[PDB]
Amino acid sequence: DERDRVQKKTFTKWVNKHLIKAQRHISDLYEDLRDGHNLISLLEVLSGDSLPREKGRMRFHKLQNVQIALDYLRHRQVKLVNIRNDDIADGNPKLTLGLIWTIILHFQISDIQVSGQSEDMTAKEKLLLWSQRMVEGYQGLRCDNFTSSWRDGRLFNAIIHRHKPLLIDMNKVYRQTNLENLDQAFSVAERDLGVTRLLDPEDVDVPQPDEKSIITYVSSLYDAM
Amino acid sequence: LGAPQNPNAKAAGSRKIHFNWLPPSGKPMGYRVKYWIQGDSESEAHLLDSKVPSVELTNLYPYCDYEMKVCAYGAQGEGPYSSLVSCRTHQEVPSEPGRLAFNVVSSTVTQLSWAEPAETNGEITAYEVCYGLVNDDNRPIGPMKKVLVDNPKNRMLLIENLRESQPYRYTVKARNGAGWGPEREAIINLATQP
């Protein structure tokens, strides 16, 4: 619940980022999507294609509006399980979160490519392999999961420094707090790599950080490299 | 062709309202009433042919703003339309809540998730979740355990400390100013569940 809110936050900031071209912005994920007009804009941008829109205000209209968004995903071979038009237009949060994850998984974690691939691995494993491969030569650093591995934020500062050593002093991140590592990494990634601050340090420095929110941010960290 | 001044309109039920106005002077054989939802077109309104200075409108959406206006036609024809009135219908019992979707954590812990009622009929103020033991024939074993949701904002509920491999009945109801509503019920056994 409070456990869930972090993921709700991360998805919201993600959707908003890709929205702004379509100059709308979400304040609450569970309500501002129900009409589908925002959903369709997200797909209209993330692909360039031009999707249709009903303009009525009856339930039937928003139901028919959102079905257009789901069908563009269905037509794109994307596998939607246990998600109905009846689900989203009223804003069943878990199924709304579920859809937005699917979109992130399809559009931002599909073309993951790393040296030495076994062409069976899921997208996650590839990014998990990509993560490990970058932090390969650093000392005392392993990235075994998208949960408890990134708590310190040391992994973040490595992935940066591997790309561009002109911006990170690795010896310092070894000594300072988990927060200082998180914040400095995040600011560096925004001001110099053009990635958006999808995560706030306070949310991460906890025992079991939201895996889905992590995967989303490392995905945003891969586009820039 | 005089205009009918001094009209007043109010609600009469949860799905009907009553429009009255003081008669003009001239040649009205019968009346016509324009009426639409506040936020809708002027020309795209519903019209209702009346002969008497009073009507009872029907198939109106509860908790919805309405605008209306009445003219008078007869030996010369339609005259001026009266002063525009604005009336909002009463609240009503909300429908069944959305699909009951679970998120299975452990054999004793779950995550209950539902959607806001299909047609709200007013502003939903609170919900109610009730869960408990059951057999195979949907006949409960013991009392339900009703937990009042605090605010209508949250549709998420956590449920822990439960018997494993035992079927449970869950119910969700919706409350809006008019009162409670019909329930949505799901039988779910966390063992069979993924």
Swiss-Prot record, chain A:
Post-translational modification: Phosphorylated by CDK1; regulates dissociation from intermediate filaments during mitosis.
Expressing tissues: Widely expressed with highest levels in muscle, heart, placenta and spinal cord.
Cellular localisation: Cytoplasm, Cytoskeleton; Cell junction, Hemidesmosome; Cell projection, Podosome
Annotated Calponin-homology (CH) domain residues: 5-108, 121-225
Known partners and oligomeric status: Homodimer or homotetramer. Interacts (via actin-binding domain) with SYNE3. Interacts (via calponin-homology (CH) 1 domain) with VIM (via rod region). Interacts (via N-terminus) with DST isoform 2 (via N-terminus). Interacts with FER. Interacts with TOR1A. Interacts with ANK3. Identified in complexes that contain VIM, EZR, AHNAK, BFSP1, BFSP2, ANK2, PLEC, PRX and spectrin. Interacts with COL17A1.
Domain remark text: The N-terminus interacts with actin, the C-terminus with vimentin, desmin, GFAP, cytokeratins, lamin B; whereas both the N- and the C-terminus can bind integrin beta-4.
Function summary: Interlinks intermediate filaments with microtubules and microfilaments and anchors intermediate filaments to desmosomes or hemidesmosomes. Could also bind muscle proteins such as actin to membrane complexes in muscle. May be involved not only in the filaments network, but also in the regulation of their dynamics. Structural component of muscle. Isoform 9 plays a major role in the maintenance of myofiber integrity.
The family this protein is said to belong to: Belongs to the plakin or cytolinker family.
Name recorded for this polypeptide: Plectin
Source organism of the structure: Homo sapiens (Human)
Swiss-Prot record, chain B:
Tissue expression pattern: Integrin alpha-6/beta-4 is predominantly expressed by epithelia. Isoform beta-4D is also expressed in colon and placenta. Isoform beta-4E is also expressed in epidermis, lung, duodenum, heart, spleen and stomach.
Post-translational modification: Palmitoylated by DHHC3 at several cysteines of the membrane-proximal region, enhancing stability and cell surface expression. Palmitoylation also promotes secondary association with tertaspanins.
Annotated compartments: Cell membrane; Cell junction, Hemidesmosome
Domain (Fibronectin type-III): residue spans on this chain: 3-92, 96-194
Membership in a protein family: Belongs to the integrin beta chain family.
Disease: Epidermolysis bullosa, junctional 5A, intermediate: A form of epidermolysis bullosa, a genodermatosis characterized by recurrent blistering, fragility of the skin and mucosal epithelia, and erosions caused by minor mechanical trauma. JEB5A is an autosomal recessive, intermediate form in which blistering lesions occur between the epidermis and the dermis at the lamina lucida level of the basement membrane zone.
Subunit annotation: Heterodimer of an alpha and a beta subunit. Beta-4 associates with alpha-6. Interacts (via cytoplasmic region) with COL17A1 (via cytoplasmic region). Interacts (via cytoplasmic region) with DST isoform 3 (via N-terminus). Isoform beta-4a interacts (via cytoplasmic domain) with DST (via N-terminus). Interacts with RAC1. ITGA6:ITGB4 is found in a ternary complex with NRG1 and ERBB3. ITGA6:ITGB4 is found in a ternary complex with IGF1 and IGF1R. ITGA6:ITGB4 interacts with IGF2. Interacts with TMEM268; this interaction prevents ITGB4 degradation.
Domain notes: The VWFA domain (or beta I domain) contains three cation-binding sites: the ligand-associated metal ion-binding site (LIMBS or SyMBS), the metal ion-dependent adhesion site (MIDAS), and the adjacent MIDAS site (ADMIDAS). This domain is also part of the ligand-binding site.
UniProt function note: Integrin alpha-6/beta-4 is a receptor for laminin. Plays a critical structural role in the hemidesmosome of epithelial cells. Is required for the regulation of keratinocyte polarity and motility. ITGA6:ITGB4 binds to NRG1 (via EGF domain) and this binding is essential for NRG1-ERBB signaling. ITGA6:ITGB4 binds to IGF1 and this binding is essential for IGF1 signaling. ITGA6:ITGB4 binds to IGF2 and this binding is essential for IGF2 signaling.
Protein known as: Integrin beta-4
Natural source organism: Homo sapiens (Human)
Gene expressing this chain: ITGB4
Portion of the full-length sequence here: 1127 to 1320 of 1822
